[PDB]
Design a protein around this ligand. Structure first.
Ligand code: CL
Lengths: 188, 187
């Protein structure tokens, strides 16, 4: 469904070393939908089959939860003060940023786990599919939070790799904890 | 197995002039695996049957060995210097490049040795299978070493054969020497 099936023992049907087979790849429309299909087609790609995919799905779920909560908070704050919310404010050091970094970390791992082939999208094209998927799942209007803003935040993540922001390992524990227990923690 | 059977005497069961039969091909999914099947199915295509196929297998083995070793070295070098390795560095003049050129030389020879007919893949499709096979066998992440880089290096090889680097003949001897070497005597 929308939510990832919990996996307390972190057990997967296929080994971590195995490549994930690609969805149908014949044409350009197939190519742009690869990430969306990996993410959402639980008939072809059930929860619990591939560790890399489940981790990515969890990161997405956590991000979507946070962006929706933050959007609602900002919208209500604007309303209480008699003003129209003009744009979503994306802070670079909080829970949203952390969740987005999880998405980026795991979309990279997912990309590397996908079966190579002549029609496998290039990395830039593949990671370019991430904002549209987050937009649709979040239901946050693009007039409030644009693909261009996502691009900026992606660039920030690229730069941070090459404050007391969680490391890659910290972020993986965050994802694993959620997958095991359904438990998320935002520092307050 | 994973490794090519050593062949100190360079003896092959079939003559070099003989065409290699294609694997059974029902569909387009079969078609995109043709190179991988030729390369890895040693039940249908045992080592020591076709010189052309064995030479290609050796080229692949040498390349895969080198790319994995070079990746590991670069990854460790990055770690020691407190940085996340961002991209694989592909040197154009060393063992890696030489082995890649061997792969290209021999994938061409292999293609030309495949039994002609309507089922034989087109060249563009066939050579297109080479980078994915090298990626899968190496297990080097594509975020580090992309298909696009392979494409660029392939083009470099095409351009070089339309300096300072082993010739086609030298690269063939390289392959032959590897295939012969490690059986316990030098021949
Ligand atoms: Cl390049």
């Amino acid at each position: 469904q929308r939510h990832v099936q919990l996996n307390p023992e972190l057990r997967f049907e296929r080994p971590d070393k195995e490549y994930i087979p690609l969805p149908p790849l014949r044409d350009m429309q197939d190519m742009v939908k690869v990430l969306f299909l990996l993410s959402t087609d639980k008939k072809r790609y059930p929860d619990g089959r591939h560790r890399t995919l489940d981790y990515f799905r969890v990161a997405v779920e956590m991000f979507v939860t946070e962006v929706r909560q933050e959007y609602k908070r900002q919208y209500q704050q604007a309303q209480r003060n008699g003003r129209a919310m003009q744009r979503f404010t994306w802070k670079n050091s909080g829970e949203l940023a952390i969740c987005f970094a999880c998405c980026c970390d795991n979309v990279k791992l997912l990309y590397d786990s996908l079966q190579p082939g002549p029609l496998k999208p290039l990395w830039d094209a593949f990671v370019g599919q991430l904002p549209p998927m987050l937009i649709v799942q979040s239901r946050v209007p693009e007039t409030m939070l644009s693909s261009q803003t996502y691009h900026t935040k992606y660039m920030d993540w690229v730069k941070g790799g090459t404050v007391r922001f969680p490391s890659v390992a910290d972020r993986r524990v965050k994802v694993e904890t959620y997958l095991r227990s359904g438990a998320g923690y935002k520092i307050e």
